[model samples]
Each structure stands twice: as structure tokens, then as C-alpha cells.
Target: NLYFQGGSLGTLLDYAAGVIPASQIRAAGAVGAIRYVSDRRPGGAWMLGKPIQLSEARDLSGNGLKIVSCYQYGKGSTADWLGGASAGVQHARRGSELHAAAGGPTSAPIYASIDDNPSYEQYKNQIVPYLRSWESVIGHQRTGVYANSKTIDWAVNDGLGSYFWQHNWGSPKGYTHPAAHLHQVEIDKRKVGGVGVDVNQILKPQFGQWA
Candidate 1:
């Protein structure tokens, strides 16, 4: 039900005013936060995009929207945390930096996408510990998970994250109602506002209510 995107720092205001059609957005959901990624060393996540700045985020707010305040960390088709807890702390530190760059809330959710339907063993042994490690740097309530219903359910049950962004595009049965906060309904290759992005919808309480 929400929409979030970033164009050029100089022309974001203009392109947003033009291509960011305010039809099915804003009213049904929140004018949510802008998203970013935290890549360390050679991993390089989301190399195609750049981090959004606080100044740019204020412009987005000026145009009547909030930033996703989310940070993504993880390599291409690989989910490994080198030093376990230490690596998680690293992600949290870098995530905090990017979150501040987007004017993110101190308690905003930081998400790590789950890919390829990792087994429950991997989820428990690797991913869960990493998330908990992040909580060691940030608060436990600030971590989030971006995955399908199954993974979302597992993480919630395991207390990995409080916020869940359920992705439906890759699932055969599409989005099923879980106790998730946001549901990403579609991902298209099309470009908008000088960026390539995915479209998502909010299914739970309004923005700032996730806590």
C-alpha cells in the first residue's frame, strides 16, 4: 500500500513529482521510507544502486513521504557471516550509518533478504545468529526479515525479527497472509524515476506502528 523510491539527488524532486504518480499510493498505505543497502568489503550487495542521503531524504519528506530506513546486507546467492556475532555487529554498525544517512529512526527496522529457500537448519544455525548479532548492536526490535511466508513465519517464531516484508513474487501460491507487516506484491524490470524498482504493499498497521 506504500511506495518508496529514490532518483538523482539533484533531480529527485522533479522526477518524483512527475513519474511517482500519487494514484494508488499514499491513501491506501504510508508514504514510507527510502531503502538502502550496507555492503562490506568485497561482498558488494546492490551494487547497481547508491545509498540515499539525509538531504535527499528530506526532499522526499518535503514531497510527502518517509524513507524505508531499511538496510540490506548479504552477498549474491550467498548467506554467510564470517565471524558470526562479530559479523552481525559489523552489519549493524554499517546499517546504522546508512539509516542515519536516510534520516532513519533510531528504532527503524533493518532487513536482510532471504533467498533460495534456505533450509531450516541454515536458518537456525547461520541466519538467526546473524540477526541476533545485529540486535547486539542495535535493539532486538529493530531487525527485520525480507522473505516468503515460510521464512517469515520461522523468523517470527524464532524471534529473529519484529518486522517482516513478505515477498510474494517468487512463490507459486503468491502471498499468503502471515503475521507480517509489509507484503511485496510485484517486481518488474521496468524503470521509473530514473531507477529500477519493485512495487510493494503494506498489509498491517499504518507506518510508525510496527513497534
Candidate 2:
């Protein structure tokens, strides 16, 4: 049975320079937001919105909106997951620290990102160990994955993470993984608070929400 029927929609708004006001997020019809818990990457001057702050979390929660934690420090050649298990350990530690600092609940899972559309071989060699290390730092039950449908399948079959956030990068067109708790549906197609935001569908009642 599906955990959620006719799943609800939400938003994931990470700006390059400024924080999108919680008011704008609500005005855009988002029930909640998936926010970053990782710090800015080296040389990432545009990552001003990263590592969601305590004030931001308070503002969002005060507005009766939900908040979920996601971690992604780098992308492309600088992707955090590229460093394998050691990277997972490092990122998970930092992610968890930031999550707590931002007032996220200890019970909430932090979604570690697999932003690339990598091959199965890479998934086995790098992603698996990476997620495994995350499990080591923050227990398997609190380890969430942000990946494409294929990677989500692999992780699910392997019993890797408790929460799944599926992105469309390497997925088949229009396919949403049944195990996915959250699925990113649109990218850079909308603006809230004058900042570009990606939209997501909340497929479960508990998608690592902190409040």
C-alpha cells in the first residue's frame, strides 16, 4: 500500500545569493521546503543560501511550514560523493552538525546527495560505500538519499537508506520510484521570494520533516 495517496506538492529552494523569505515560499503554495544542511563549497561564492541557519528554520517553522534537511556541498567535478566512504563520513558529520545547529530534530533524517547520473558500476564502487559511511555516522535509520530513480532502486534493494528523495537527472522520463518519499519534479522553472526554486512532490506523510 502507498504511504500517501495523491501525494502533496512542495518546494526545494536553494538560492545562489539570498534566502527566499518564508512568506514567499508560502505565497508560492509550497507546504514545506527541503533545505540544505551542508556548508558552502570551496570557491562557491554563490552558495550564500547554503547550510540553512537557525533563524531561517525558526522563521519557516513559525509560519507553520515543514522543514527537511538535505546535504550537498559540491557538484560536477567537485561532487562530495566522489570521495567514496571517507567522504560520506566527512559529509555526514558536518551535515548532522549543521542540522542540529539549525534546530533540526535528532529523529529527522538528513538526505545525502548523489547529484550525478552515474553508472551502476560507479554506484557500487562509490555511492554504496559513501552511503554506508553515512549510516555509520548517523545510523541507517536516519540516513536518507537524494538520488535518481535508478540509484534509489539500487539503494532500496541493498537496504541502504530509510528515506529516498528522487531527482530526475538520470531517471527515465516521468518515472517516480515507489520507494521515493520526495521527488523533484521541476527545476529552475519558478521563482519564490525572487529566487529560483525547484519544485518537489511529497510522496509520504513523513519525508524527514523536523516539525
Candidate 3:
């Protein structure tokens, strides 16, 4: 499975057009990508040629790849909902919206990106408040985190998120998380209509679903 930054609507279609026919993807037995649900940053929307419902989710399903869904946070928080209380409140609603956008059930896991390596204190002081906010809206069991070893340990072990999306492409076999449902392996250089785009691999997807 591959998890990359979501792009225009045509992104998935392009990948399907290329990789599905390649022997490497076929021999792997299963392949797919995780779509972005939402982002706190501006211009983070997946549009035009790269939409989840209208395009690639089902188109690539025939090839044995599972189109999963996730959300990435940007520099600032911009969107809002009816019942939010604080910044954490906004995060919860964002996740909810992303979940709905991807057409996933409430039980479906939505991976929240933790791009930075935060400490236990950071997880407790900064992370959990918003995570709890999300728990209030969607329940804790459905919440998941996308981070490397340290962030995973801090979040999952401390009960911040129910699942983990481990990212360790450096040492490859060097680190592993017990709660990981998806582990990103590599960034394959692929071209879509003469334009280069990086394709990623999702290692052993557990709860497979789009949105």
C-alpha cells in the first residue's frame, strides 16, 4: 500500500494507469493508496481529477489494491463545526468531515498525521487534548495516528490513538510498531503522462477501507 500527499483528482487515475499493469505491482499481490481526508492547511483539498468518490477508489479496487483514507494537518486551523470548544474541537470536526468526505463509516480508522516528533509531554500537553476532542465526536477506537517510532510510542502507548501508521523508510527493518495497521515502505519514482510522481507502498494493511 502507498501513502503519499493527496493531489488533484487525476492523481489516482494516473497511478492506476501506470502501476496496475506493471509486473512488480501484480506480483506483490496487493497494492493501493491512502487518500487524504482533509488538512488544516490552505489549498489542501483533493480536487478535479483526484477525487475519492468519483475516481480511483473503485477503479483501482479491481487490481487488489485497497484505497484507504487519512488526514494530514497543516500549519494553521481554518475550518470549523457546530460543537467545537477549542483548537482540539476543530480537529475533531475536521476528522469527522474527512471521514464523511471519504464515505467511511464511523468505525473506519482515519489516520491523523503527526509530522513532527513530539515528546510524551508534547503528546500529553498538545496532542491528547485535540485527540480527546476527536474522541468526543467519533469515539476513541476509530482514531489513529501516522508518525514514526517516537510519536507512535507516545501516542499509541499512552492511549491517544487506537491505531498507528508507522513510517520508517530509513532503516527499513529497524523499527516496528505493535499497533501499526499500515507501514509505508518506499517511495517509487513513477511518471503519469510525462509528469513524475512518487508512488508509495503500504506494508500489510489491516483495516482496509477508503474514506
Q: Using TM-score as the measure, which candidate wins?
A: 2
Cα lDDT tens digits for candidate 3, 1-211: 2333332121121222222332333444335456666642446343332224424444555566556666655642432212223665666577677557655666577766665555566666677676677667767777777677677766666677776777663223545555566655444465444423344334343544553
- The regions of model 1 sitting more than 4 angstroms off are 1-30, 40-48, 80-83, 169-172, 207-211
Cα lDDT tens digits, model 2, 57-171, are: 9999999888889999999999988999999999999999999999999999999999989999999999999999999999999999999999999999999999999998989
lDDT of 1 by residue, 46-152 (tens): 25444555565566566566456555555444443434566678777888787766677775677655644666787677777777887787777777767778777
By the TM-score metric, which is better: model 2 or model 3?
2
Best by lDDT: 2
Ranking by lDDT: 2, 1, 3
Colliding residue pairs in candidate 1: 1-201, 1-202, 32-66, 33-66, 33-67, 33-68, 34-67, 34-68
Comparison by lDDT, 2 against 3, better one: 2
TM-score of each: 0.73, 0.94, 0.66
User: Higher-TM-score candidate among 1 and 2?
Assistant: 2
* Global lDDT scores for all candidate models: 0.56, 0.87, 0.53
